């Protein structure tokens, strides 16, 4: 009721204060989701998150607060899907018990993307990835699990077919298994690239020099290049890997530096 109009005003103040477009988008959907929610406990959380976001200037913490508001408003009350509430709780518990902000960002992003996909394969993959991350305290392993879970959920949100999503699932297993063996973060980023390539049905060429590992992806169009870039850049930021991006027409060139 009264909180919904206050949430819209608080979300408007954040949009005008900051210039980060991702913060402005998160503030937008936080106001949209809150207006469609009648639960008072949901509205008080997203308003409490928006108020603390206005008390801060650090864009990394404002994004995290906004991600909590989006996830809770997406599935944080009764009359929501029981499986969506489980995934929301797993990401919130994993984020509360972690120190690295990239683990907090990855856990919330992966959960939000899985709920919006409405795909049963994406819901179970992210659910099992969050439980696997909670079972260990290896922050380096947790960051690789969340990067793979988020990129896989993006494929479902983007509308990947069941056949291509299944091939992408086999790479999710391979990436997680390779992270538990201590594989370098560069090879884990290369696996994210391969996951998105098979998930969208295109091809890739890998030219390995040992120093400049370059991947050339052909046949991608506008929406596909945005989804691929969002998944790979998110993984690189969580793994601490420097990546160079170049696109031209329907081709995307990705260089993974150590």
């Amino acid at each position: 009721g009264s909180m919904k109009e206050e949430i819209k005003r608080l979300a408007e103040e954040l949009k005008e204060k900051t210039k980060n477009e991702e913060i402005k988008r998160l503030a937008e959907e936080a106001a949209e989701l809150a207006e469609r929610s009648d639960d008072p406990e949901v509205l008080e959380v997203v308003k409490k998150a928006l108020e603390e976001a206005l008390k801060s200037k650090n864009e990394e913490k404002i994004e995290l607060l906004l991600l909590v508001a989006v996830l809770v408003a997406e599935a944080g009350s009764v009359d929501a899907v029981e499986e969506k509430l489980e995934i929301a709780l797993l990401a919130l518990k994993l984020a509360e018990e972690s120190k690295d902000p990239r683990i907090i960002r990855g856990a919330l992003r992966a959960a939000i993307a899985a709920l919006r996909s409405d795909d049963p394969l994406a819901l179970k993959t992210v659910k099992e990835a969050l439980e696997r991350a909670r079972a260990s305290k290896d922050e380096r392993l947790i960051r690789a699990i969340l990067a793979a879970a988020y990129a896989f959920a993006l494929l479902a949100v983007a509308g990947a077919s069941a056949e291509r999503l299944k091939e992408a699932e086999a790479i999710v297993k391979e990436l997680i298994a390779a992270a538990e063996k201590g594989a370098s973060p560069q090879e884990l980023v290369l696996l994210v690239i391969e996951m998105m390539v098979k998930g969208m049905g295109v091809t890739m060429e890998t030219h390995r020099s040992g120093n400049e590992v370059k991947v050339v992806i052909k046949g991608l169009h506008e929406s596909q290049q945005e989804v691929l870039l969002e998944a790979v850049l998110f993984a690189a930021e969580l793994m601490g890997v420097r990546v160079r991006i170049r696109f031209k027409g329907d081709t995307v060139t990705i260089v993974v530096r150590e």
């Binding site: 639960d39 406990e41 949901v42 959380v45 409490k48 998150a49 603390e52 008390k55 801060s56 650090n58 913490k61 995290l64 607060l65 909590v68 996830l71 809770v72 599935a75 944080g76 009350s77 009764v78 009359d79 929501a80 029981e82 509430l85 489980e86 929301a88 709780l89 919130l92 518990k93 984020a95 509360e96 907090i104």
Partner: peptide
């Protein structure tokens, strides 16, 4: 169960927000 799951979501989210609020 949905009521109990929703309660844990609100409780955990409130603690996560105060956690991000204290740390800078």
């Amino acid at each position: 169960r949905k009521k109990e799951l929703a309660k844990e979501v609100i409780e955990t989210a409130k603690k996560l927000i105060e956690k991000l609020a204290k740390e800078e």
